[PDB]
Design an enzyme around this catalytic site. Structure first.
Site, PDB file in Angstrom:
ATOM      1  N   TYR A  27     -10.208  22.712   9.876  1.00 11.62           N
ATOM      2  CA  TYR A  27     -11.332  23.627   9.461  1.00 11.62           C
ATOM      3  C   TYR A  27     -12.164  22.935   8.513  1.00 11.62           C
ATOM      4  CZ  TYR A  27      -8.643  27.584  10.696  1.00 11.62           C
ATOM      5  OH  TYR A  27      -8.001  28.504  11.681  1.00 11.62           O
ATOM      6  N   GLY A  29     -15.877  21.087   8.177  1.00  5.55           N
ATOM      7  CA  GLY A  29     -16.973  20.887   8.818  1.00  5.55           C
ATOM      8  C   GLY A  29     -16.800  22.103  10.017  1.00  5.55           C
ATOM      9  N   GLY A  31     -15.467  23.123  12.794  1.00  3.28           N
ATOM     10  CA  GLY A  31     -14.526  24.050  13.185  1.00  3.28           C
ATOM     11  C   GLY A  31     -14.115  25.388  12.366  1.00  3.28           C
ATOM     12  N   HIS A  47     -12.253  28.175   1.988  1.00  2.70           N
ATOM     13  CA  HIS A  47     -13.762  27.730   1.987  1.00  2.70           C
ATOM     14  C   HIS A  47     -14.286  28.602   3.011  1.00  2.70           C
ATOM     15  CE1 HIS A  47     -17.776  25.789   1.770  1.00  2.70           C
ATOM     16  NE2 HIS A  47     -17.729  26.247   0.514  1.00  2.70           N
ATOM     17  N   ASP A  48     -13.941  28.472   4.328  1.00  2.00           N
ATOM     18  CA  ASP A  48     -14.643  29.246   5.378  1.00  2.00           C
ATOM     19  C   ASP A  48     -14.321  30.893   5.244  1.00  2.00           C
ATOM     20  OD1 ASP A  48     -15.193  26.711   6.940  1.00  2.00           O
ATOM     21  OD2 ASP A  48     -13.678  27.124   8.319  1.00  2.00           O
ATOM     22  N   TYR A  51     -16.958  32.189   2.571  1.00  2.00           N
ATOM     23  CA  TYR A  51     -18.279  32.346   3.142  1.00  2.00           C
ATOM     24  C   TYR A  51     -18.393  33.638   4.378  1.00  2.00           C
ATOM     25  CZ  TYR A  51     -20.316  27.758   2.032  1.00  2.00           C
ATOM     26  OH  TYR A  51     -21.099  26.743   1.548  1.00  2.00           O
ATOM     27  N   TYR A  64     -28.528  26.955  -4.788  1.00  2.00           N
ATOM     28  CA  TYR A  64     -28.309  27.671  -5.952  1.00  2.00           C
ATOM     29  C   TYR A  64     -28.380  26.443  -6.816  1.00  2.00           C
ATOM     30  CZ  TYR A  64     -23.595  25.686  -4.465  1.00  2.00           C
ATOM     31  OH  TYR A  64     -22.914  24.707  -4.156  1.00  2.00           O
ATOM     32  N   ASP A  89     -18.131  27.414  -3.149  1.00  2.00           N
ATOM     33  CA  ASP A  89     -18.352  25.959  -3.161  1.00  2.00           C
ATOM     34  C   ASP A  89     -17.653  25.319  -4.386  1.00  2.00           C
ATOM     35  OD1 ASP A  89     -19.930  26.311  -0.927  1.00  2.00           O
ATOM     36  OD2 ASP A  89     -21.972  25.539  -1.725  1.00  2.00           O
TER      37      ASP A  89
HETATM   38  C1  LIG Z   1     -26.262  22.253  10.970  1.00  2.00           C
HETATM   39  O1  LIG Z   1     -25.673  20.908  10.976  1.00  2.00           O
HETATM   40  C2  LIG Z   1     -24.616  21.043   9.905  1.00  2.00           C
HETATM   41  C3  LIG Z   1     -23.517  21.999  10.290  1.00  2.00           C
HETATM   42  C4  LIG Z   1     -22.392  22.096   9.512  1.00  2.00           C
HETATM   43  C5  LIG Z   1     -22.068  21.239   8.357  1.00  2.00           C
HETATM   44  C6  LIG Z   1     -20.963  21.258   7.539  1.00  2.00           C
HETATM   45  C7  LIG Z   1     -20.932  20.444   6.631  1.00  2.00           C
HETATM   46  N1  LIG Z   1     -21.883  19.230   6.068  1.00  2.00           N
HETATM   47  C8  LIG Z   1     -23.014  19.195   7.103  1.00  2.00           C
HETATM   48  C9  LIG Z   1     -23.185  20.004   8.064  1.00  2.00           C
HETATM   49  C10 LIG Z   1     -24.367  20.009   9.091  1.00  2.00           C
HETATM   50  O2  LIG Z   1     -25.439  19.054   8.859  1.00  2.00           O
HETATM   51  C11 LIG Z   1     -25.119  17.659   9.073  1.00  2.00           C
HETATM   52  C12 LIG Z   1     -21.654  18.557   5.265  1.00  2.00           C
HETATM   53  C13 LIG Z   1     -20.580  18.361   4.124  1.00  2.00           C
HETATM   54  C14 LIG Z   1     -19.375  19.397   4.601  1.00  2.00           C
HETATM   55  C15 LIG Z   1     -18.375  19.312   3.514  1.00  2.00           C
HETATM   56  C16 LIG Z   1     -17.393  20.408   3.944  1.00  2.00           C
HETATM   57  C17 LIG Z   1     -17.658  21.157   4.728  1.00  2.00           C
HETATM   58  C18 LIG Z   1     -18.581  21.345   5.895  1.00  2.00           C
HETATM   59  C19 LIG Z   1     -19.651  20.385   5.480  1.00  2.00           C
HETATM   60  O3  LIG Z   1     -16.440  22.165   4.995  1.00  2.00           O
HETATM   61  C20 LIG Z   1     -15.617  21.607   3.943  1.00  2.00           C
HETATM   62  O4  LIG Z   1     -16.283  20.642   3.259  1.00  2.00           O
END
Ligand SMILES: COc1ccc2cc3[n+](cc2c1OC)CCc1cc2c(cc1-3)OCO2
Length: 121
Positions: A27, A29, A31, A47-48, A51, A64, A89
């Site tokens: 989960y 990032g 996925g 968290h997903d 959102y 924000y 967040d």
């Molecule tokens: C459009 O590109 C994306 C798409 C998705 C991204 C998702 C995330 N980040 C960059 C992204 C990004 O930019 C590089 C950076 C940090 C991070 C921490 C997280 C997370 C998701 C992400 O879930 C839990 O903690």
């Protein structure tokens, strides 16, 4: 936005969001499938889901503002979307800090094919 989320995560856990939390488990990032692997992965799952409660919001790009009071994260007043995104967040950043003891390098860059099963929000 990811800019604020990234900064919270670093402040809370001392780890940079990329790459410690952007390719972790099923989960964190990109996925979103199967059973979360451990507590940290569950934080991402919730968290997903958080959102997912906000259809008409753009949590990746909407900025924000938040402040620290006595170390505590306090979301400042913005639009409705900005407030609700900040609360998602903030909860994740705390969840990560709470489960830092069990964070495992083993789950970094985890296989997609090993994300199996199902779990609804
Ligand atoms: C459009 O590109 C994306 C798409 C998705 C991204 C998702 C995330 N980040 C960059 C992204 C990004 O930019 C590089 C950076 C940090 C991070 C921490 C997280 C997370 C998701 C992400 O879930 C839990 O903690």
């Amino acid at each position: 936005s990811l800019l604020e989320f990234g900064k919270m995560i670093l402040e809370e856990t001392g780890k940079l969001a990329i790459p410690s939390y952007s390719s972790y488990g099923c989960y964190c990032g990109w996925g979103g499938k199967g059973t979360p692997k451990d507590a940290t992965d569950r934080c991402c799952f919730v968290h997903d889901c958080c959102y997912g409660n906000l259809p008409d919001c753009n949590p990746k790009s909407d900025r924000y503002k938040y402040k620290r009071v006595n170390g505590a994260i306090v979301c400042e007043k913005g639009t409705s979307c900005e407030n609700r995104i900040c609360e998602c967040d903030k909860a994740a950043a705390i969840c990560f800090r709470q489960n830092l003891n069990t964070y495992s390098k083993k789950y970094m860059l985890y296989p997609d094919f090993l994300c199996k099963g199902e779990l609804k929000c």
